[PDB]
């Protein structure tokens, strides 16, 4: 079956973040911060589809054994099944370095980029990650980058299979522990 997601957005300044991670080790199990760093690359297929087959491929240069992973996400959904999280259509496959040269055949090209570097924590199905986004100038190299923002762009993700609804109760109840610290929202990808 085809799986779907649940995304919660936000932006928190780094000076007030130090208390928030104190909660992350105060309720979850004994995990430590990771500070993973990935390279991100936007591609698209100009097929006969009205919406171009646009996808985002990640590759972790810091960790060996993790190959190129393509993520093709769908349009925003206005359904009444989930009113507080993003409902998306996604297919997620990991393939080796034969991805990038193969993508040159159908005209997958330079759209934009954003370099992700930061922490990730989990509790069951919820995955909260706090990462810096980096923008490049002269996009040929990877060293001439800078901070795209000062405020940390914090995200929360929950993965689910096709169906398997009635999830907004548990995420909201677990976020009620952190409501005075964070105010998660379901923002549109546009405007």
């Amino acid at each position: 079956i085809n799986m779907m997601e649940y995304l919660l957005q936000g932006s928190v300044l780094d000076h007030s973040l130090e208390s928030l991670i104190h909660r992350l080790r105060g309720l979850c199990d004994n995990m430590e911060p990771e500070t993973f760093l990935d390279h991100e690359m936007v591609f698209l297929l100009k097929g006969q589809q009205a919406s171009p087959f646009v996808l985002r491929a990640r590759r972790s240069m810091d960790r060996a054994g993790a190959p190129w992973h393509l993520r093709y996400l769908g349009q925003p959904e206005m359904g009444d099944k989930n009113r507080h999280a993003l409902v998306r259509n996604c297919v997620d496959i990991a393939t080796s370095e034969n991805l990038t040269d193969f993508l040159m055949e159908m005209g997958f090209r330079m759209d934009h980029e954003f370099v992700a570097k930061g922490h990730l924590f989990r509790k069951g199905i919820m995955k909260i990650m706090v990462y810096k986004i980096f923008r490049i100038l002269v996009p040929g190299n990877t060293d001439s980058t800078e901070a795209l923002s000062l405020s940390y762009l914090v995200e929360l993700s929950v993965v689910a299979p096709a169906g398997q609804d009635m999830v907004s109760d548990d995420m909201k109840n677990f976020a009620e522990q952190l409501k005075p610290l964070v105010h998660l929202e379901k923002i549109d990808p546009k405007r």
Binding site: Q9, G10, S11, V12, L13, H15, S16, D111, H112, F114, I133, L148, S149, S151, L153, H183, I187, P189, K190, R191
Partner: peptide, 24 residues
Amino acid sequence: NKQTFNPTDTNALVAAVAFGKGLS
């Protein structure tokens, strides 16, 4: 008392990576 979160800046961040503005 301080705006650690900025909704205008957050809405600018979610739109800056959406398409090609502010890169040239």
